[PDB]
Design a protein around this nucleic acid. Sequence first.
RNA 1: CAUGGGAUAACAAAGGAGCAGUUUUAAAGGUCUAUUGGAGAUUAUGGAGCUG
RNA 2: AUCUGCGCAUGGCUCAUUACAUCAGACGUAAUCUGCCGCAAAAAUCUUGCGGUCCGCAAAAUUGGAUAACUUGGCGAAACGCCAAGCUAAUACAUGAACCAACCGGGUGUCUCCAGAGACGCCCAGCGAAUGAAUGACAAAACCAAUGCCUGCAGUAACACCCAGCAGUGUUGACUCAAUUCAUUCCGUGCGAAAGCCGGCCCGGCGUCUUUUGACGAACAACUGCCCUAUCAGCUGGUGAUGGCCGUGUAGUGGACUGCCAUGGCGUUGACGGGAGCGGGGGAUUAGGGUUCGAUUCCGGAGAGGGAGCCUGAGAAAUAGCUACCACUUCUACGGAGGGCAGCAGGCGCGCAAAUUGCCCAAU
Lengths: 38, 156, 183, 260
Amino acid sequence: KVRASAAERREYLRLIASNRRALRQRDHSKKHTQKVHA
Amino acid sequence: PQYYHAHQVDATIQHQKAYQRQTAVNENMHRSSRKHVNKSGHIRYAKKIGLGFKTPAKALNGKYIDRKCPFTSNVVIRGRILRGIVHSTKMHRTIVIRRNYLHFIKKYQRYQKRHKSLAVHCSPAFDPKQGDEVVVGQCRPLSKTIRYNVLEVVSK
Amino acid sequence: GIVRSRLHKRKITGGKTKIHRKRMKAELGRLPANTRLGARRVSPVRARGGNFKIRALRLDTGNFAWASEAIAHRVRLLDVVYNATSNELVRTKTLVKNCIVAVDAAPFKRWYAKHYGIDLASPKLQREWIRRRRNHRVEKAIADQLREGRVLARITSRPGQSGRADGILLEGAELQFYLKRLE
Amino acid sequence: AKKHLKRLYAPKDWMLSKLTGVFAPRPRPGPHKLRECLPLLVIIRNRLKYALNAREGEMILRQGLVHVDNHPRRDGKYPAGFMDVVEIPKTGDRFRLMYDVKGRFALVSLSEAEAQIKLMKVVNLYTATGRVPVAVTHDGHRIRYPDPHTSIGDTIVYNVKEKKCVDLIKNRQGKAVIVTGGANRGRIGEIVKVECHPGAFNIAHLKDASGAEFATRAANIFVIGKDLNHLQVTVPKQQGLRMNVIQEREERLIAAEARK
RNA sequence: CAUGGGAUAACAAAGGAGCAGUUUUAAAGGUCUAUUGGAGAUUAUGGAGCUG
RNA sequence: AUCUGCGCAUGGCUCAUUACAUCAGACGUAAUCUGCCGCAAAAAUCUUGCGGUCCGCAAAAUUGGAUAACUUGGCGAAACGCCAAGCUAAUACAUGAACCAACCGGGUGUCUCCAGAGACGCCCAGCGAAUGAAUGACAAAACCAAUGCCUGCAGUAACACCCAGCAGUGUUGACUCAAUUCAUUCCGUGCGAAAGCCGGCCCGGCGUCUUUUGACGAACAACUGCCCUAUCAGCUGGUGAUGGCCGUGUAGUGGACUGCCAUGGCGUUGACGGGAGCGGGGGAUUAGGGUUCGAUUCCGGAGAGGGAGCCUGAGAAAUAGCUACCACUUCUACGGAGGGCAGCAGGCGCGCAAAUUGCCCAAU
Ligand SMILES: NC[C@@H]1O[C@H](O[C@H]2[C@@H](O)[C@H](O[C@@H]3[C@@H](O)[C@H](N)C[C@H](N)[C@H]3O[C@H]3O[C@H](CO)[C@@H](O)[C@H](O)[C@H]3N)O[C@@H]2CO)[C@H](N)[C@@H](O)[C@@H]1O
Ligand SMILES: [Mg+2]
Ligand SMILES: [Mg+2]
Ligand SMILES: [Mg+2]
Ligand SMILES: [Mg+2]
Ligand SMILES: [Mg+2]
Ligand SMILES: [Mg+2]
């Protein structure tokens, strides 16, 4: 139950760190798709 | 090059047989971060209390060392927020406010002038004269009679 | 016993308060510790909740911190130098919070030779000393009493409450405050 | 340390008659508040008539036959309160504690799929040791890794069998609540406007299905769905609609005359 | 505690010499953040404000 | 029968005290303690066995000493009094778990590399606690050094491999808080997997340390309110009265308290002192305005013959707990030993004035 509780941290940390990744790569798209335009 | 040249003693605030310092932050940091340092020079602890009260110009850019102060200490303002008028400022760093109210008598269909006086701790951010209207906020006991602490002064 | 109530205090009108209950246990106070210098002897006190509050009698050592360097070292208290409450507490050498003491200064010099490499040569491989030491400089009033042998320091813990004599080294204007009052 | 209740100082929603004994079963600390629960001796004896007295009532409970939120409760003084799910495997009935529109506790009958989830309102959020952010709930639960969009006023759907927070309901303008305190307790309404007033009590303005406008403190509202049609949990038979006192008085006389 | 209505009254301050020019335009002198791939250290130009 | 674990701090009685007190409505605790109960958490600890004298091979850790009851001998007029010896338990007391079994971090010495990078080695790295430091957000180009991708700069999370997104993001109206990083060290005043108990035919019911928070509470603070009295006009302040500075003490805030400094604070809007006596919910009467009563069932406060002071416990300044004195007081074999009905029945007094030394846990 310490391994299972340290497993449910490692997948809460992929819920947090993926949501931060999806915001990195919607902004570096929307910056680069207007940098092409000008 | 090895020597640091620390700050000299500011004798205008240092009167009180122990060194007057703020417990929140250390005055003696060499490369103190931009967290607590104010505009001109020195390290200072200033806090934002709750209910839409703007901290004064002093308590950010002042030099005074106050404990029991709502803006520069661990004193938290909570509970009641009241108003009074300044009655006497004769005590050191403490004022007595006067709260004047009309007490309605249900039998004689008429009001009655009563008053309550409260000892209120007054920060050196503020200099209220007699008759000035203040806003006080409740805090912990700070003395035998001090429960409130001045938040804003409305002049004259 | 000793109580902490306002039942015995006069009203602000000057009137006497007439007492209509016995003393409560929930309003007690206890006799002071009067912690002095000496070899360590402590007596625990059973507080509320069953918690233990360790009275310090006779303390000689503590962890003192050098806050610019963000380190601490277990050093030995030498003397009690200045107390803001009374000069009589200096003479009986009571340890309270905020009293000014002198400490050993030997672990601080040894740390300042091990870290920054300045004495008051052997690892030629690791000169991460050079990665530090350039921006940082040391106050002169510290380095004088550091090599003089004892450093003035300030007690930052409450010994009668915690049974510890932890502290901080006086720096800056705070050292220059207390050096004037002594000499 | 109080250990007794007088039956007059007991809550009125329990509906214990004043002439039957001096004392009422004081609910222990636990999940729900003493003022805001219905202890299991009152459910097994006074609500359901499975027990004629308190002596028959502990023959049921101490034997392990009543389950509050999937776990057998052998305490007659266990505080069961709002959104709890009370199962009984032998009689095959399972109920949910809801407030009806007159403010009293009501036992809403459930299916098997509707009896697995309960809806729980966050009361506090903090970080525990480690860096684990846990969520404190009105039922006393401490969910350790909730949905990261959890704020304090929200509602977590929980599924008490597999202890996994399956869903989240934020507290916003467009949601529907149930009122769990005050004069308006048991009423269901859409949220209209939430008046903040920092330092004091948040006031929440609410509009009912009929259009009746009413307000409460926002610590009294309990959001239970996205709208008044898409409620996440089933509600009692009035469905939060408070009829007029004149119209509901006429209908009982009409129903009693038409019955004879 | 929240909120809106502004009749009547109230607190406060004043005692009227005891008093509180707005914009376009180019010019002079002088004061203590954002970009150049990052971060560190120097460095002139410039924005907006300073006054004659 | 006795060890052990909880309980006896509730309930019940009474209303003597008591006017910046209690109490009511309403707030505060970010100034704090909190057993039982609810949902959770948990990677610290070189221990055993066998062989050899500190090492080797092993592994379901087959741990240690003492007391009751009891027996024996008893002391004493007695006492809800006692002694000595001999036995024996644990979920009492004490001791103690390597490897299975992680991630992550700091400080640091040899070794393969390049003109700083890696491998290895050592010390330290658990929850809680102390002190110190760091987080706990924010609201146009030019040149040199180190460094990033390009074949001069297109475009870009951060990071020298192990994991190319394994936290760049706690909460509040507000925190010096929640939590995390590192520095030092906790010497009993913390941390077992009870070295625990059952049950089913590996699994399931319990029972327990620590840690943490909801809940039931505790303690403090005070916004508005309160009978009569001036044949009571000044009250407080050396020996704390109002405030300020270091401390101390507390569970915590604080003249609560030591030291020092200042000269305040309250009052004809009735202070101060005296008399009446628990405070509300409420009762009686009332067109309206009122005038009265509230010892009494519910809530709160206080007390247990008066007055203290304590122990134990999560909680008592407890009284069907202890210690002492004062006033009464019972047994004695005179050596001594005890008492506490404002619990329920009763008893004597006192008065105008108030019942049964009853049956039962069937209900609450
Ligand atoms: N007045 C109460 C306070 O007493 C304090 O001082 C008091 C003490 O110095 C002293 O009180 C002592 C006390 O220390 C000691 N531990 C116990 C003793 N019973 C008390 O004595 C006091 O009480 C008894 C009975 O009332 C009287 O007989 C005695 O004369 C009186 N001095 O006497 C003073 C009271 O008269 C402070 N002066 C002050 O805080 C305040 O006056
Ligand atoms: Mg026992
Ligand atoms: Mg009365
Ligand atoms: Mg203080
Ligand atoms: Mg009572
Ligand atoms: Mg007497
Ligand atoms: Mg009787």
